[PDB]
């Protein structure tokens, strides 16, 4: 799952299996941001059946 922590500032990380530890906080913050953004929906009423 390393690729999720190397998408903000890991433009120098040569290895595709490596990530810079010092970018971890920035990457986590970004991830949380779109975690919130992707959930901005209103729950809809569909229908039921006994």
């Amino acid at each position: 799952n390393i690729h999720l922590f190397k998408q903000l500032l890991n433009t120098e990380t040569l290895s595709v299996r490596g990530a810079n530890p010092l970018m971890f906080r920035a990457n986590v913050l970004h991830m949380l941001l779109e975690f919130v953004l992707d959930n901005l929906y209103l729950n809809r009423h569909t229908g039921f059946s006994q």
Partner: protein
Amino acid sequence: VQTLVTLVAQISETQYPVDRYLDWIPSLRASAATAATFAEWVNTSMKTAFDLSDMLLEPLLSGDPRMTQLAIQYQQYNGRTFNIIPEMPGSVIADCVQLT
């Protein structure tokens, strides 16, 4: 705008009061360039989420956003000045990411 300032406050030092739960995660010594890149990423994400194509926050994005503030003033010939500082309202996105 408020979401930007809240997120930037986590990785750099600013003047607004703010909580901090991600200090145990290691991080670098943020510079102006790092802050600008982070702000640009935030702006892109926000624009994508709401289906916006034109500019958003670019007037703020010029340079260092670590100390953003909004105010406007004007001056008469005799020197009397008038200030208008909008007292910044709440924000649901910032609160929700704070909760997360």
